[PDB]
């Protein structure tokens, strides 16, 4: 399967250079264009640039002076650099496969011409002169350039959350949330993990290394007055399994390359 | 930036349309594409070339264009369709793309649902760090509005409370959490604490005690 995986720092300090990498699989970079896109929290998608099969690069004109894209076909890797970042560069960054092809403004059997009376247009092949873009000779005028691109994104990466900030990284403290007696007396028991005081986003939680997915609710983080985040995850299990079965939450904080596995034992 | 309505709404099983207005230098050239962005999932290509459905996209997603305005139409609307929808086109004669402003699709007609509430006392491990947090977890409610109140014994507690804004789950209901920060002695000095969650006028209360 065509697959795209972004990697790079989660936290970057202002004025520094953001360097991301996209590792691709299931195709050769020699044969497919790859692009970069970002979306800031609560804003619209923003095109960054792309690198074509031959290495030709194209960038968002407003950002071109700050961007650099390169690739290594043998490594199946594409890179992005964004120089002199500020907080407005905080965003989820996606790499993606790009299908782009040059198309003529006019269908086959037609020729593009700008010598026509009234503007540029499409003239039937065979027709001579400046009236050929008029209805009686089978042609028409157009405001489209001579050649355009059929452009779209085929597949997207999951995206990498990037926070620009002067604040240091802080990995979470993980506390097991044991199920109390009177709350488990109904058949199902809820146990959880408190993921406290971390920066920046994001944190992922799984239970028993992914073997436990049904009945897992991992909640969005709260942002504290201290500037640090906290979140919780909860899983519901049969109350008869408590004490017999081992339940472990796997808390991953990629910004600090740190993962914590905490056993949650019954009271 | 191409012009899209900020928001559109439709009813379950009905049809909605989302418009995307540009100029002759982008949309007017054709080859508009459409993308579905659901939080927690990779962006998903729906439509390319004005009208062609991408792989895996069902026929209830359709695209069309008239001049400088392109339209996405979604029929047999499901709750799963709630998302942010973006159009895009290449610009002028370049491989550079311009995206739309984005449209948030809300699907109305979903059944109301009461919140499930779980309240956790401070863990022994946290108390050994000289801290105490009560965790009130609120899940599986619709619509996405709740209010949270905390009580120590019978008296309201307002300091030390932080509550998240509601966000949609993967099953299309809403979730929220509330945290009450206490000192270990405050925790131990009262006979109970309670999280009270109000939704559509009705309230559910959960209580935990130090013992």
From Swiss-Prot, chain A:
This is Immunoglobulin gamma-1 heavy chain. Keywords: Adaptive immunity, Cell membrane, Disulfide bond, Glycoprotein, Immunity, Immunoglobulin, Immunoglobulin domain, Membrane, Pyrrolidone carboxylic acid, Repeat, Secreted. It comes from Homo sapiens (Human). It is found in: Secreted; Cell membrane. Immunoglobulins, also known as antibodies, are membrane-bound or secreted glycoproteins produced by B lymphocytes. In the recognition phase of humoral immunity, the membrane-bound immunoglobulins serve as receptors which, upon binding of a specific antigen, trigger the clonal expansion and differentiation of B lymphocytes into immunoglobulins-secreting plasma cells. Secreted immunoglobulins mediate the effector phase of humoral immunity, which results in the elimination of bound antigens. GO terms for biological process: adaptive immune response. Coiled coil: none annotated. The chain holds residues 114 to 220 of 449 of the full protein. Immunoglobulins are composed of two identical heavy chains and two identical light chains; disulfide-linked. GO terms for cellular component: extracellular region; immunoglobulin complex; plasma membrane. The keyword Transferase does not apply. Residues 172-265 form the Ig-like domain. It comes from the Eukaryota. Disulfide bonds join 193-249.
Swiss-Prot record, chain B:
The keyword Nucleus does not apply. Its main location: secreted. Keywords: Adaptive immunity, Bence-Jones protein, Cell membrane, Disulfide bond, Immunity, Immunoglobulin, Immunoglobulin domain, Membrane, Secreted. GO terms for biological process: immunoglobulin mediated immune response. GO terms for cellular component: blood microparticle; extracellular exosome; extracellular region; extracellular space; IgG immunoglobulin complex; plasma membrane. Residues 124-209 form the Ig-like domain. The keyword Ribonucleoprotein does not apply. It is found in: Secreted; Cell membrane. Displays the following serological isotype: Mcg-, Kern- and Oz-. Immunoglobulins are composed of two identical heavy chains and two identical light chains; disulfide-linked. Constant region of immunoglobulin light chains. Immunoglobulins, also known as antibodies, are membrane-bound or secreted glycoproteins produced by B lymphocytes. In the recognition phase of humoral immunity, the membrane-bound immunoglobulins serve as receptors which, upon binding of a specific antigen, trigger the clonal expansion and differentiation of B lymphocytes into immunoglobulins-secreting plasma cells. Secreted immunoglobulins mediate the effector phase of humoral immunity, which results in the elimination of bound antigens. This is Immunoglobulin lambda constant 2. It comes from Homo sapiens. The gene is IGLC2. The chain holds residues 16 to 103 of 106 of the full protein.
């Amino acid at each position: 399967q065509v697959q795209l995986r972004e990697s790079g720092p989660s936290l970057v300090k202002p004025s520094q250079t953001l360097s991301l990498t996209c590792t691709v699989s299931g195709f050769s970079l020699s044969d497919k264009a790859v692009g970069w896109v970002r979306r800031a929290p609560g804003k619209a998608l923003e095109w960054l640039g792309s690198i074509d099969t031959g290495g030709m690069t194209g960038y968002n004109p407003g950002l071109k002076s700050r961007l650099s894209i390169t690739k290594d076909n043998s490594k199946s890797q594409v890179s992005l650099s964004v120089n002199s970042v500020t907080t407005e560069d905080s965003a989820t960054y996606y790499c993606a496969t790009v299908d782009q092809k040059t198309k003529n403004a006019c269908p086959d059997d037609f020729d593009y011409r700008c010598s026509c009376i009234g503007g540029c247009g499409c003239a039937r092949k065979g027709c001579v002169g400046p009236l050929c873009c008029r209805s009686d000779l089978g042609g028409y005028l157009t405001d489209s350039p001579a050649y355009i691109y059929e452009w779209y994104i085929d597949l997207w990466g999951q995206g990498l959350l990037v926070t620009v900030s002067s604040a240091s990284t802080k990995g979470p403290s993980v506390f097991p949330l044991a199920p109390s007696s009177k709350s488990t007396s109904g058949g199902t028991a809820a146990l959880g993990c408190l993921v406290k005081d971390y920066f920046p986003e994001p944190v992922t939680v799984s239970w028993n290394s992914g073997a436990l997915t049904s009945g897992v609710h991992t909640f969005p983080a709260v942002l504290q007055s201290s500037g640090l985040y906290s979140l919780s995850s909860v899983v519901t299990v049969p109350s008869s399994s408590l004490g017999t079965q081992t339940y472990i939450c796997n808390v991953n904080h990629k910004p600090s390359n740190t993962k914590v596995d905490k056993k949650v034992e019954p009271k | 930036v191409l012009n899209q309505p900020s928001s559109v709404s439709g009813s379950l099983g009905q049809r909605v349309s989302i418009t995307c207005s540009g100029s002759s230098s982008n949309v007017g050239n054709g080859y508009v594409s459409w993308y579905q962005l659901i939080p927690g999932s990779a962006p998903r290509t729906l439509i390319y070339g004005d009208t062609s459905r991408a792989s895996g996209v069902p026929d209830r997603f359709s695209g069309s264009r008239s001049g400088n305005t392109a339209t996405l139409t979604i029929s047999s609307l499901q709750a799963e369709d709630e998302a942010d929808y973006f159009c895009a086109s290449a610009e002028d004669s370049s491989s550079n793309a311009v995206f739309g402003s984005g449209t948030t699709l809300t699907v109305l007609g979903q059944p109301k649902a009461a919140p499930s509430v779980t309240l956790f006392p401070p863990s022994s491990e946290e108390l050994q760090a000289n801290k105490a947090t009560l965790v009130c977890l609120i899940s599986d409610f619709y619509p996405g509005a709740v209010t949270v109140a905390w009580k120590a014994d019978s008296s309201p507690v307002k300091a030390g409370v932080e509550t998240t804004t509601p966000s949609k789950q993967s099953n299309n209901k809403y979730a929220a959490s509330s945290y009450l920060s206490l000192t270990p002695e405050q925790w131990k000095s009262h006979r109970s604490y309670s999280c009270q969650v109000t939704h559509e006028g009705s309230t559910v209360e959960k209580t935990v005690a130090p013992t």
